[PDB]
Design a binder for this molecule. Structure first.
Ligand code: FAD
Length: 473
């Protein structure tokens, strides 16, 4: 009677809540991962993400072998294959860590129900969050739609520490392997076999080992300057751990512990502040994940009533130029180029290009949300939807109407155009002054396009549409 542990976005053996809980029940612990066609074949899957995922799985296969058992690989529909696998193995139970997204939660409910019908226990525990969505509630027992109060609560809650890595596992026998032979893939498919290609690199190399190494390195040095270095795209001031957190190559308790230890080690007020600021970013992460959990309709698009009626202009040609980094706005194009070429973008840049697509181009932001999901190595529904709702204050933590001025943003966060010239080398000959203002002479512009829109006119247009709608309602 073995216990199966179903991995999804927790591709590591260390600090894994459900895995550690399973090990406490049995040493005959076998891991499994199911390549779900509804996920892998989605038009919203990003090649960079498949590449990172695949790399994480290669290491996980090794970790299980070294631990004493193995990682089973399946390809097909979870609610059909997992119960069948469990039944063929006469599994005592199937464990996994809970999801916050609509698809995963619906899927899990079905798998759990199928397992129950088969008389097999299903244990679903919280792992990817320091505090589950049901632990953080207002005085009236309700979820938060405003960040301030959420943080006040979240910050005061006792923090959990990392759990133990399972050891001394017992592998499946030949007879057990024969019983499940039909449900398994003989080996982990290569990226190319899956029909994907990616050669743009990663913010952090794939796998548990690389993630843990990055966390330690960051907390050992860079984290001390996080504030204000986190604001400048030209600087490598952030952790680059986003895909590791999205796929769980690193445990959230490990991340919190490393930062906490660095804070206790530091004797500098500035360093301590920088570390606290990084820790709060983890809080923002939970704010958006808890929001998606409590208000799943957020995934459908503009949340607030007014925004569900916004008269998006939707000029496809403008959207296309945005996707191809041909907007004529240096700060925006450099950012879009970084995204398509490397699958990652500095947060200040995500804010900048999002504001541009939504406010300047006036394109339904779901188009941008989707493009980001089709290219981000860290593409995450909760954080991505949170970022795009943010571009219009159409969801959680709404703020008064505001429109970023690309030139103002560039001058403030890329004052010497170092980031711009880095991703737009064909403009390295241009003075930072003009790259920031976005006013480049045709001769020095070469093949670089002219601005696709006039910011002042677009800003007036967006405000006019907003004010007219607000009045009509
Ligand atoms: C339009 C838009 C889309 C976004 N899309 C994503 C996305 O698909 N996936 C993703 O994980 N984040 C997204 N972000 C949030 C963000 O830009 C980062 O998580 C990312 O830049 C991570 O870089 P890092 O790992 O170096 O972050 P660090 O600065 O080192 O922060 C550490 C961790 O905190 C979390 N984090 C930081 N900023 C935020 C935030 N604003 N919201 C949620 N989590 C945050 C991430 O897990 C990150 O790895 C989006 C933001 C915007 C404005």
């Amino acid at each position: 009677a073995p216990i199966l542990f179903w991995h999804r976005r927790d591709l590591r053996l260390s600090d894994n809540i459900g895995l550690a809980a399973a090990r406490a029940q049995s040493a005959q612990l076998i891991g499994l991962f199911c390549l779900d066609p509804q996920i892998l074949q989605s038009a919203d899957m990003a090649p960079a993400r498949v590449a990172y995922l695949q790399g994480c799985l290669q290491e996980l296969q090794q970790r299980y072998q070294q631990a004493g058992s193995r990682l089973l690989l399946l390809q097909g529909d979870p609610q059909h294959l997992i119960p069948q696998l469990a039944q063929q193995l006469q599994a005592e139970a199937v464990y996994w860590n809970q999801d916050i997204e609509p698809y995963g939660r619906d899927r899990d409910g079905q798998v759990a129900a199928a397992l129950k019908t088969a008389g097999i226990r299903a244990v679903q525990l919280w792992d990817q969050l320091l505090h589950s969505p049901d632990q953080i509630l207002s005085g009236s027992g309700n979820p938060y739609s405003v960040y301030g109060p959420f943080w006040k609560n979240w910050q005061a809650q006792p923090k959990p520490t990392p759990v133990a890595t399972p050891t001394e596992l017992v592998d499946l026998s030949p007879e057990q392997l024969t019983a499940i032979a039909p449900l398994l893939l003989s080996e982990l498919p290569t990226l190319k076999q899956l029909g994907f290609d990616w050669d743009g690199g990663f913010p952090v190399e794939p796998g548990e080992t690389a993630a843990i190494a990055r966390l330690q390195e960051f907390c050992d040095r860079a984290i001390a300057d996080y504030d204000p270095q986190r604001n400048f795209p030209a600087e490598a001031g952030t952790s680059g751990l986003s895909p590791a957190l999205k796929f769980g190559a690193i445990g959230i308790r490990q991340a919190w512990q490393a930062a906490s230890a660095a804070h206790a080690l530091s004797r500098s007020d500035e360093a301590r502040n920088s570390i606290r600021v990084w820790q709060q970013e983890l809080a923002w992460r939970e704010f958006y994940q808890h929001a998606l959990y409590h208000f799943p309709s957020l995934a459908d698009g503009p949340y607030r009533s007014l925004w569900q009626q916004f008269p998006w202009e939707n000029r496809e040609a403008l959207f296309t130029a945005w996707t191809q980094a041909q907007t004529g706005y240096p700060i925006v194009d450099a950012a879009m180029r970084q995204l398509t070429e490397t699958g990652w973008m500095h947060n200040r840049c995500r804010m900048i290009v999002a504001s541009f697509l939504t406010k300047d181009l006036i394109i339904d932001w779901r188009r941008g949300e989707q493009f980001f999901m089709q290219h981000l190595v860290d593409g995450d529904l909760a954080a991505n939807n949170g970022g795009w709702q943010w571009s219009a204050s159409s969801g959680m933590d709404p703020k008064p109407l505001r429109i970023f001025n690309p030139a103002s943003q560039a001058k403030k966060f890329d004052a010497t155009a170092t980031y711009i010239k880095r991703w737009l080398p064909e403009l390295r000959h241009v003075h930072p002054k003009d790259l920031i203002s976005g006013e480049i002479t045709p001769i020095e512009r070469r093949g670089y396009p002219a601005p696709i829109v006039n910011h002042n006119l677009r800003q007036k247009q967006f405000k006019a549409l907003y004010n007219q709608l607000k009045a009509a309602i």
